[PDB]
Amino acid sequence: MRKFDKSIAAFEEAQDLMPGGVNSPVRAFKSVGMNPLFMERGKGSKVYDIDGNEYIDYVLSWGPLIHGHANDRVVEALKAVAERGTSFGAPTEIENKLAKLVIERVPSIEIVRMVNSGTEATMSALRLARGYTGRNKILKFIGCYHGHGDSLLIKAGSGVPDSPGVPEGVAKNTITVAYNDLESVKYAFEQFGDDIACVIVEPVAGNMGVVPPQPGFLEGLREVTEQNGALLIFDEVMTGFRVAYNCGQGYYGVTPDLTCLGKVIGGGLPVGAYGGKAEIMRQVAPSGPIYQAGTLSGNPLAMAAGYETLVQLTPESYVEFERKAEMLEAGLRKAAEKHGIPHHINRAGSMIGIFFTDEPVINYDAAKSSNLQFFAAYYREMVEQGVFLPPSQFEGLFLSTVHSDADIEATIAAAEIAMSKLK
Amino acid sequence: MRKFDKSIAAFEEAQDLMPGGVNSPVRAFKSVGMNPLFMERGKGSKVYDIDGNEYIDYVLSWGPLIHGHANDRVVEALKAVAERGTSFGAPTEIENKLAKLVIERVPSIEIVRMVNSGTEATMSALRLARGYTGRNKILKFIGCYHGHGDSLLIKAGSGVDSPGVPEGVAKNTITVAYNDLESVKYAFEQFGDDIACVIVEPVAGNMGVVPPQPGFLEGLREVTEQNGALLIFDEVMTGFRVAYNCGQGYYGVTPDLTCLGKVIGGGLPVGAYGGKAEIMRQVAPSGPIYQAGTLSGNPLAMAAGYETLVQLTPESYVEFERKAEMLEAGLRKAAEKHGIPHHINRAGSMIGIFFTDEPVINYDAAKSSNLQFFAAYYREMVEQGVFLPPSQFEGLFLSTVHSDADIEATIAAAEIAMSKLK
Ligand SMILES: *Cc1c(COP(=O)(O)O)cnc(C)c1O
Ligand SMILES: *Cc1c(COP(=O)(O)O)cnc(C)c1O
Ligand SMILES: [Ca+2]
Ligand SMILES: [Ca+2]
Ligand SMILES: [Ca+2]
Ligand SMILES: [Ca+2]
Ligand SMILES: [Ca+2]
Ligand SMILES: [Cl-]
Ligand SMILES: [Cl-]
Numbered sequence: 001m002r003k004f005d006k007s008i009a010a011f012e013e014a015q016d017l018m019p020g021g022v023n024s025p026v027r028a029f030k031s032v033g034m035n036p037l038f039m040e041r042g043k044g045s046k047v048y049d050i051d052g053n054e055y056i057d058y059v060l061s062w063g064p065l066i067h068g069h070a071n072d073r074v075v076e077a078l079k080a081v082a083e084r085g086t087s088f089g090a091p092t093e094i095e096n097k098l099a100k101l102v103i104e105r106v107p108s109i110e111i112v113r114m115v116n117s118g119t120e121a122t123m124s125a126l127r128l129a130r131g132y133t134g135r136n137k138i139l140k141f142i143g144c145y146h147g148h149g150d151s152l153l154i155k156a157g158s159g160v161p162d163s164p165g166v167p168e169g170v171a172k173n174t175i176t177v178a179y180n181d182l183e184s185v186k187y188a189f190e191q192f193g194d195d196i197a198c199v200i201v202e203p204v205a206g207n208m209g210v211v212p213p214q215p216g217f218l219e220g221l222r223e224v225t226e227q228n229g230a231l232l233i234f235d236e237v238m239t240g241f242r243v244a245y246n247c248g249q250g251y252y253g254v255t256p257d258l259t260c261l262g263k264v265i266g267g268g269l270p271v272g273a274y275g276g277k278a279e280i281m282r283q284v285a286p287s288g289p290i291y292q293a294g295t296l297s298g299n300p301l302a303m304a305a306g307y308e309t310l311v312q313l314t315p316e317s318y319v320e321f322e323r324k325a326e327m328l329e330a331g332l333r334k335a336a337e338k339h340g341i342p343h344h345i346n347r348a349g350s351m352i353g354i355f356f357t358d359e360p361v362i363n364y365d366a367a368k369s370s371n372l373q374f375f376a377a378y379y380r381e382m383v384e385q386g387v388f389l390p391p392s393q394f395e396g397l398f399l400s401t402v403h404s405d406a407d408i409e410a411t412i413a414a415a416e417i418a419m420s421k422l423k
Numbered sequence: 424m425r426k427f428d429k430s431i432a433a434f435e436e437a438q439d440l441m442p443g444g445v446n447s448p449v450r451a452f453k454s455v456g457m458n459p460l461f462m463e464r465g466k467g468s469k470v471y472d473i474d475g476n477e478y479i480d481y482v483l484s485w486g487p488l489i490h491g492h493a494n495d496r497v498v499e500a501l502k503a504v505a506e507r508g509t510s511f512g513a514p515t516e517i518e519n520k521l522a523k524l525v526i527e528r529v530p531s532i533e534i535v536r537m538v539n540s541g542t543e544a545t546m547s548a549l550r551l552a553r554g555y556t557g558r559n560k561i562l563k564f565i566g567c568y569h570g571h572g573d574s575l576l577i578k579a580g581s582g583v584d585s586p587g588v589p590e591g592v593a594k595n596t597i598t599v600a601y602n603d604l605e606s607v608k609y610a611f612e613q614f615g616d617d618i619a620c621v622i623v624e625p626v627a628g629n630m631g632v633v634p635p636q637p638g639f640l641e642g643l644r645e646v647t648e649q650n651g652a653l654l655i656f657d658e659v660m661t662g663f664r665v666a667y668n669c670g671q672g673y674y675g676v677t678p679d680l681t682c683l684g685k686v687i688g689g690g691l692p693v694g695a696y697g698g699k700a701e702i703m704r705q706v707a708p709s710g711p712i713y714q715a716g717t718l719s720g721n722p723l724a725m726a727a728g729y730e731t732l733v734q735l736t737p738e739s740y741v742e743f744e745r746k747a748e749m750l751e752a753g754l755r756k757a758a759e760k761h762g763i764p765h766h767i768n769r770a771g772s773m774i775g776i777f778f779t780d781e782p783v784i785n786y787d788a789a790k791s792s793n794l795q796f797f798a799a800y801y802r803e804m805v806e807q808g809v810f811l812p813p814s815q816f817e818g819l820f821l822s823t824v825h826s827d828a829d830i831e832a833t834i835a836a837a838e839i840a841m842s843k844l845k
Contacts, residue, residue: 007514010514010516010519011514013519014514014518014519014522017519017522017523017526017534017535018518018522018534018535018536018537019534019536019703019704019705019706019707019708019709019710020706020707020708020709021514022514022708022720023514023518023536023537023716023719023720024512024715024716024717024719024720025707025708025713025715026512026715027512027513027514028708030708036513036514037513037514038513038514038515038516039508039511039513039514039515040507040515040516041507041508042507042508042511043508047508047511047513050516059511059512059513060512061510061511061512061717061718061721062512062717063717064510064717064718065510069508070505070506070507070508070509075505075506078501078502078505078509079501079502079505082493082498082501082502082505083493083498084463084464084465084492084493085462085464085465085466085470085492085493085690086493086501086690086691086727087484087487087488087690087691088462088465088470088482088484089447089449089450089482089483089484089485090450090459090460090461090462090482090810091430091433091434091437091444091445091446091450091459091460091461091462092461092462092463093433093461093463093473095437095441095446096433096436096437096440099437099440099441100440103440111440111441111442112440112441113441113442113446114441114446116539116540116542116543116692117539117540117543117692117716117717117718118717119543119716120539120540120542120543120571123546123571123572123573124571126587127571127573127585127587127588128587129587130586130587130588130589131585131586131587132587134586136589136590136591148543148546148547148550148713148714148715148716149546149572149573150546150550150572150573150574150592151573153713156713159707159708159713159715160707160713161711163550163554163711163712163713164553164554164557164711164712165549165550165551165552165553165554165555165712166550166553167553167559167591167595168559169559169589169591169592169594169595170573170591170592172591173589173591262717263717266718268508268509268510268721268723269509269510269691269692269718269721269723270539270540270691270692270718270721270724281442282442283442284442284443285442285443285448285582285583286442286443286445286448286451286453287442287443288442289585289586290585290586290587291448291571291576291579291582291583291585292571293447293448293449293571293582294446294447294540294542294571295447295484295485295486295487295540295541295684295685296484296487296540296688296691296692297446297447298445298446298447299484299690299691299692301690301691302692305509388513
């Protein structure tokens with residue numbers, strides 16, 4: 001029987017310091033109605049709470065830890081940079097080294113700009129798209145999260161009416177359509193087409209759980225934007241370096257005008273980036289008039305973590321991710337079928353998510369049919385069995401290059417027990 | 424004679440990779456017309472370029488490096504955290520430790536929320552003010568920079584109005600001159616029912632160092648209180664730098680919300696917004712105001728911030744003020760000697776020199792600085808081994824490790840640079 005005494009006491013302290021006792025809303029474990037787990041350390045695919053409990057980690061800091069916790073190569077590079085200075089406020093050669101790697105790895109990126117988060121990357125790409133086209137409106141999808149820039153906080157799904165504090169002056173310039181609903185994007189262009197600066201889309205939706213694009217969706221977005229003079233922006237903050245070697249755009253063969261990156265690009269440190277066609281990126285200050293800056297953007301510590309992370313990813317890493325994701329899908333499918341549990345498993349490249357509904361999960365509306373009581377009961381038992389999954393039905397399982405076949409087998413064995421207690 | 428050949432070759436490569444070859448506009452050294460210096464390493468108050476040139480550093484990454492480069496305690500704390508994992512996406516005890524220190528250090532902060540930058544801190548504080556008051560308009564000052572959130576990119580001054588910001592956003596931002604309380608009163612007379620907040624730097628730092636005039640900050644507190652608007656202090660630069668208890672503690676003016684950054688991270692990407700508990704309670708997950716961040720409160724950044732802040736004592740500020748007084752005297756002595764127009768501003772520990780005899784009390788007066796004198800002065804300071812901010816519209820940053828010998832060498836270098844202007 002797992003004990004959470006130390007985590008309970010630390011959360012009593014936290015609640016008197018931060019809103020809801022956390023620095024990010026999902027960390028309060030409210031979706032599963034459990035006491036939040038306080039983490040002490042990690043190594044590879046293993047994470048340890050302050051009560052000394054060990055877990056197989058499928059959260060990986062919500063995506064960044066593609067090589068798990070404390071990867072030796074990343075750690076040594078961080079220690080070497082720290083001794084020489086973590087930030088200078090002037091150019092460094094390490095910034096060149098990561099920018100070159102990102103340009104080579106991401107198809108659409110010819111010129112890149114580093115920032116400190118995915119929120120900074122998407123807000124900057126929207127400003128660039130509006131400035132480049134001379135247009136006001138942006139189109140996004142219902143149930144999709146792109147960070148907390150005001151224009152993007154409209155119908156942002158699970159966890160996010162729409163956030164107060166966002167004026168009508170902002171809301172009026174954001175159009176929202178159901179993810180995977182190509183015809184409704186086409187209809188929006190019939191009304192707003194020459195005032196739409198951009199369409200922003202996740203190549204695989206990740207905030208409504210894992211929802212892959214339907215056939216013809218992404219290709220359709222590329223067609224409608226280019227025919228109407230709008231930019232196509234791929235928000236690859238979660239998908240980038242994770243769904244495939246050359247990202248979602250590489251995986252599906254659809255090339256956007258601009259791409260936003262985060263999460264894995266930092267390998268455990270706060271890093272984001274936006275990049276794309278050279279003629280568009282040239283409009284960003286100091287080369288152009290569209291202002292964006294950051295004090296810690298491109299700092300050597302974050303560039304080293306990001307470089308050491310990305311250089312260790314090869315095409316073979318993704319073949320292994322796909323093999324493990326297929327094994328997890330089969331094991332979860334077998335456990336749900338054995339116990340008569342409604343379930344739908346989505347898989348796109350390395351990404352995988354299980355929804356507690358029999359409905360085919362193709363959009364936010366279908367995702368919302370998930371049985372959240374079953375999710376919370378399944379989650380509670382997975383914690384008891386030593387598995388740390390994302391505490392939300394509206395998230396996929398994150399894999400690392402360090403998950404072993406023994407980890408996968410133990411996860412499936414835990415899921416069988418967890419499914420057996422639902423009904 | 425100093426050589427910059429390796430920095431020149433590295434910038435040639437950078438220009439094919441990033442817009443303007445940089446990750447932040449100031450780094451391109453365009454205000455001074457020079458080849459950007461590529462930095463390799465630093466130690467204490469010393470910074471080294473890739474050509475092997477040593478500099479006395481007054482940039483300190485534009486504020487964060489209050490203990491200079493590679494402070495041993497900060498480095499040892501980063502190394503120890505890295506070995507155990509830099510980010511978990513679940514709560515940690517180190518986040519409690521830093522939040523507790525910040526709540527104690529910053530007067531107005533009862534509840535705090537960590538973010539990854541000053542830009543994230545200010546955009547969130549504006550959204551919270553609008554949500555809390557149910558109002559749309561924000562008031563900021565001309566020539567002041569609060570980060571790149573769309574609402575704040577109006578009259579943002581030196582380096583910055585940006586295209587890509589729709590009129591839908593612009594119509595909700597009111598801008599008036601810094602240190603002009605009467606225009607603020609007028610703005611409240613005309614639009615007061617719709618003003619969610621006034622955002623202000625306790626000491627302006629983006630138009631060079633411009634301290635507040637008598638009655639300005641108090642007047643902002645009074646006008647906001649009386650009209651139901653919040654008072655937000657942008658202490659991203661002033662926080663933990665101008666005084667032990669920040670700008671608000673130094674001037675004795677308590678805002679509703681405070682934004683932090685820069686020194687709070689000690690050289691790592693960290694920001695924060697905090698304030699009255701009943702306001703902060705409206706932020707998610709406690710309330711309906713949405714704000715989140717994946718790397719927010721990560722242990723590596725919490726450890727860097729904690730070790731940085733715990734090492735600052737009231738005595739650190741007595742020493743900063745002593746050194747800033749020495750710099751002001753020596754710089755003033757050099758300008759008078761060479762007949763150079765000058766105005767030196769000092770607020771707490773902060774210091775800036777303007778190449779104008781006009782009293783610099785706002786952006787319009789700061790704009791009277793002779794930029795050709797600034798660039799000529801700057802080029803000679805680099806030749807003498809001093810790394811200053813490459814802009815007239817920035818003050819000099821001191822660290823706890825700048826020695827008296829560093830200060831004296833800086834003054835002697837300024838004497839030579841002033842001698843070549845006229
Ligand atoms: C997490 C995420 C973001 C925001 O990134 P942060 O670093 O948390 O600000 C943006 N877009 C997507 C698709 C994400 O998953
Ligand atoms: C630098 C600065 C900011 C922005 O902080 P970043 O971390 O660069 O986003 C905000 N306000 C003030 C006063 C600043 O000096
Ligand atoms: Ca490319
Ligand atoms: Ca082209
Ligand atoms: Ca900057
Ligand atoms: Ca306080
Ligand atoms: Ca009170
Ligand atoms: Cl939907
Ligand atoms: Cl002015």
